[PDB]
Amino acid sequence: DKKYRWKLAETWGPNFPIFGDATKNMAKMVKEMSNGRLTIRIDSSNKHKSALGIFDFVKSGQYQMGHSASYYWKGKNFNTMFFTTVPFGMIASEQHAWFYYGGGMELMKKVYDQYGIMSFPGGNTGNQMGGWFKKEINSVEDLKGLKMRIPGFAGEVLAKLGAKPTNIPSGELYTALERNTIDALEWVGPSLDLRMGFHKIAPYYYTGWHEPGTELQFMVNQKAYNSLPKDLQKILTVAMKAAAYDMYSQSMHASGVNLASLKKDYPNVQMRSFPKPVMEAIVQANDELLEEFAAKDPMTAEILKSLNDYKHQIRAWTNLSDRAYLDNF
Amino acid sequence: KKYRWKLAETWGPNFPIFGDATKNMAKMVKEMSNGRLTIRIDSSNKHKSALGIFDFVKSGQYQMGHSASYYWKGKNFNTMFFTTVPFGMIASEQHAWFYYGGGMELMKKVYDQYGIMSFPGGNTGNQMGGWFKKEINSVEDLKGLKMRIPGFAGEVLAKLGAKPTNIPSGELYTALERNTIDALEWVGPSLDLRMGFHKIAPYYYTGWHEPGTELQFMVNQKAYNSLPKDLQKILTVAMKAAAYDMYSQSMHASGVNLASLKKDYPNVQMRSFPKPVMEAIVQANDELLEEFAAKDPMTAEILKSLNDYKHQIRAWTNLSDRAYLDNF
Ligand SMILES: [Ca+2]
Ligand SMILES: [Ca+2]
Numbered sequence: 001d002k003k004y005r006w007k008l009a010e011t012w013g014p015n016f017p018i019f020g021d022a023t024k025n026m027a028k029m030v031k032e033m034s035n036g037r038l039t040i041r042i043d044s045s046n047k048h049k050s051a052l053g054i055f056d057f058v059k060s061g062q063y064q065m066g067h068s069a070s071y072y073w074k075g076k077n078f079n080t081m082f083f084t085t086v087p088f089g090m091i092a093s094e095q096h097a098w099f100y101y102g103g104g105m106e107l108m109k110k111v112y113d114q115y116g117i118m119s120f121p122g123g124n125t126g127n128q129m130g131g132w133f134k135k136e137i138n139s140v141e142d143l144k145g146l147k148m149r150i151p152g153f154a155g156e157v158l159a160k161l162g163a164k165p166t167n168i169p170s171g172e173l174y175t176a177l178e179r180n181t182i183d184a185l186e187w188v189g190p191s192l193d194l195r196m197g198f199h200k201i202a203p204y205y206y207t208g209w210h211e212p213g214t215e216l217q218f219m220v221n222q223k224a225y226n227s228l229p230k231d232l233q234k235i236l237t238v239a240m241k242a243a244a245y246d247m248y249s250q251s252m253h254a255s256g257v258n259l260a261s262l263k264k265d266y267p268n269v270q271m272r273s274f275p276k277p278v279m280e281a282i283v284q285a286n287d288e289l290l291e292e293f294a295a296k297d298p299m300t301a302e303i304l305k306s307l308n309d310y311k312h313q314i315r316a317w318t319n320l321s322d323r324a325y326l327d328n329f
Numbered sequence: 330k331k332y333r334w335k336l337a338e339t340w341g342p343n344f345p346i347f348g349d350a351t352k353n354m355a356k357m358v359k360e361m362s363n364g365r366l367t368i369r370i371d372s373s374n375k376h377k378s379a380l381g382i383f384d385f386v387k388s389g390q391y392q393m394g395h396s397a398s399y400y401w402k403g404k405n406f407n408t409m410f411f412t413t414v415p416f417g418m419i420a421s422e423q424h425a426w427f428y429y430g431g432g433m434e435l436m437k438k439v440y441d442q443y444g445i446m447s448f449p450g451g452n453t454g455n456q457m458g459g460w461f462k463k464e465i466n467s468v469e470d471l472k473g474l475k476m477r478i479p480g481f482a483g484e485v486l487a488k489l490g491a492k493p494t495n496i497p498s499g500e501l502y503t504a505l506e507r508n509t510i511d512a513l514e515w516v517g518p519s520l521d522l523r524m525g526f527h528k529i530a531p532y533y534y535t536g537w538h539e540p541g542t543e544l545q546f547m548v549n550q551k552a553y554n555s556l557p558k559d560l561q562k563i564l565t566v567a568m569k570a571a572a573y574d575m576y577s578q579s580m581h582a583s584g585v586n587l588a589s590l591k592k593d594y595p596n597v598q599m600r601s602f603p604k605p606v607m608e609a610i611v612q613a614n615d616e617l618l619e620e621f622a623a624k625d626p627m628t629a630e631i632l633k634s635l636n637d638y639k640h641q642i643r644a645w646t647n648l649s650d651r652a653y654l655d656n657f
């Protein structure tokens with residue numbers, strides 16, 4: 001008899017490629033698979049006016065669903081950071097193993113259940129670039145007072161070294177950089193960074209370290225989910241899984257297409273790496289901070305131990321398999 | 330209302346990972362469809378024809394199969410390319426190629442002539458070079474080497490004097506114990522341990538030949554067309570989600586089993602093919618590919634797609650994950 005009409009709030013602006021494709025793809029799959037019994041309207045930042053309001057929208061049930069990143073909610077609960085990615089952590093293929101087979105989904109459920117929110121993988125970008133900089137980073141002294149848009153745990157790490165991170169939303173990044181409200185920023189990589197224009201005013205494009213395997217997030221209000229019949233519940237969860245996996249393939253695809261153009265069409269972009277002493281300080285600050293976060297909360301210790309042990313185990317296989325292969329051929 | 334389908338799979342019963350992919354798909358379809366589509370899975374113990382899947386599905390005796398596309402290379406050489414290629418793409422790259430790079434559509438052009446629909450069926454990731462009784466120190470050690478190895482790699486190693494040999498799977502261990510073969514490859518730590526090859530072959534080589542083995546679901550086209558559109562989408566989305574989950578599971582099982590291997594099997598010795606040998610295999614591979622491409626237009630089209638795409642995507646893999654792994 002009954003049809004369900006839901007709405008999804010997403011962080012991204014309207015027609016945002018790749019990220020906005022995952023939500024649309026998800027919604028279309030649900031509509032088709034349900035023969036119209038479950039339909040999901042997508043509201044982008046231009047509609048709901050709150051790019052970073054998604055967690056509150058879904059908790060309250062004003063929206064039944066959201067699409068965002070777990071690490072945006074660090075202010076609400078620092079344990080939300082670790083389900084997105086961590087500096088020096090796992091690459092995408094590893095993190096998927098961790099989520100679906102290494103206990104990651106279950107840890108995420110223990111963190112989010114307290115809010116009456118269900119959280120699911122919402123798409124991986126793969127390994128992200130270090131970002132866009134107006135001036136080169138030559139020593140740790142260059143990080144002091146550096147105003148940089150960078151989320152999650154890397155933001156905390158750079159702050160420990162004297163930087164001033166912020167979490168300005170995608171639609172506001174260019175203007176903030178143009179005005180020197182930030183001196184640098186990171187977003188994703190070649191899949192998405194070029195159309196956003198940062199290259200016009202920040203010519204140094206740094207390689208990564210901080211976001212090896214960024215997974216986005218779908219969120220679903222538990223009470224809304226419970227109201228669904230069981231077959232539509234499954235349709236929803238399988239659609240989100242499929243859309244999320246495909247987003248990693250799209251991120252890979254787009255990164256290749258866009259890197260090819262970058263190699264040919266941007267004579268003023270200069271790719272850079274952090275000097276060894278800078279990277280050494282960052283690795284250390286990361287280790288120091290992980291140890292500090294782990295000690296102040298047993299749920300944090302549990303999550304970081306799972307990530308750390310799991311990375312140790314799976315990286316050995318990555319090294320024996322794909323890395324050996326990519327290094328050699 | 331209620332569709333009752335069967336699927337025939339190459340693998341024996343309760344085969345971990347590969348047999349999980351089909352069970353996982355069937356469970357997702359039953360549940361999403363509220364029972365309107367269910368799929369019984371017959372393993373090889375039941376239909377008795379591990380390499381009969383292609384014909385089962387083509388005839389419609391079974392609505393679906395799960396197997397590997399390169400097992401059909403004897404029927405049509407172009408089926409090899411949708412599993413994997415020596416020195417080709419790793420799994421994350423190959424998924425991009427399938428879904429955004431034109432691979433699904435090429436696959437369709439090949440399989441449409443048989444009234445079969447082929448879909449990705451799960452990636453194993455990068456596979457080990459295999460299990461060896463004697464070390465491969467030079468190209469001379471390949472000559473006369475009897476080895477179980479499928480797909481294009483088998484065609485390459487033959488070109489170099491080896492004797493790719495056919496053996497079912499249940500007999501892989503025995504064949505190697507009986508010296509019917511001198512070596513073999515299967516998959517990697519995820520599945521090789523349960524097979525006991527480490528007991529008979531001390532040397533375990535790293536890969537080259539199957540950098541991203543994608544299995545396949547097959548669906549009989551007429552059967553597919555008999556479904557209403559909502560069931561059709563349930564089936565295809567289920568297949569996609571199960572396929573992707575199998576790579577996650579393969580990664581997971583590999584990490585687990587590599588740790589177990591290192592703790593429990595002391596005299597498994599990790600090797601890599603010396604440089605002059607890989608240069609020789611590389612060269613044979615390329616020469617041989619150019620040969621097959623020149624004889625068959627569909628082959629040329631598929632290899633140009635695969636090569637152009639690999640060159641593109643690999644530059645990003647190198648800049649992103651590879652550099653990251655190398656540096657940390
Ligand atoms: Ca980022
Ligand atoms: Ca193999």
Ligand SMILES: [Cl-]
Nearest residue numbers: 077079111299
């Ligand atoms: Cl918590």
